[PDB]
Structures are given as C-alpha cells and as structure tokens.
Amino acid sequence: KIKEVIVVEGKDDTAAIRRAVDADTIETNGAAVGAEVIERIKLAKERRGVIIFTDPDFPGEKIRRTIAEQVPGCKHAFLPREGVEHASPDDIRQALANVYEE
C-alpha cells in the first residue's frame, strides 16, 4: 500500500514494519549488499521509489550509506530518537510520516 519499497536489513525489520503499515520491502541480509540486491533496489526506485529504513547504529548507517551511494534518489526513514526490528508501531509510522522528499 505504501508506494515506495522499503529497504531494510532483514526479516525481523520487515515483520516489525508489516505490524504497523502495509509495505513491500527489500532485505539486504546484513551489511554485505551484493549487486543482485542493488539491481532489485534500482528497479524499485524507478518504478515506485525506495525508502531506506535501517538502524541508527554503525552497521545500519553503513548499510544506508552503501545503498544511497549506489542508488541515487532513495528517500530515508529514521527511527525517532526516543533497532527497526523492535520499533513500536508508532515509531514505524512516525519514521515513515517524516521522510523528507527532495
């Protein structure tokens, strides 16, 4: 239902996201993003756009950085300051409500 595909690290992130919103996701399987995942993310960005939604720790920002610099034009969702896998439904909604679109 959410237009953009949401890029996350793994299944616990997807599950947590689908407990709050209806969204299609792409899972990176850790911080090692192979080009096969990139080409999925690429197709998704041009057909529907992509929201990157990873943790605010060192692994998660490294994942976010790696993708964004290979796929320009991704949007970014950030957990409210108060991991995605354990994020409350309201945290997920807030994260997605506040995506900047530029």
SS (H, E, C) the chain: CCCCEEEECCHHHHHHHHCCCCCCEEECCCCCCCHHHHHHHHHHHHHCCEEECCCCCHHHHHHHHHHHHHCCCCEECCCCCCCHHHCCHHHHHHHHHCCCCC
**Which residues does the annotation place in the binding site?**
9, 13, 55, 57, 85
Q: Which domains does the chain have, with CATH numbers?
A: 5-98 (3.40.1360.10)
Contact 99, 75 (CB under 8 A): yes
DSSP element (H, E) containing 75:
strand 75-76
**Which residues does the annotation place in the binding site for Mg(2+)?**
9, 13, 55, 57, 85
DSSP element (H, E) containing 6:
strand 5-8
Task: Report resolution (Å) to 1 decimal.
Answer: 2.1
Query: What experiment produced this structure?
Result: X-ray
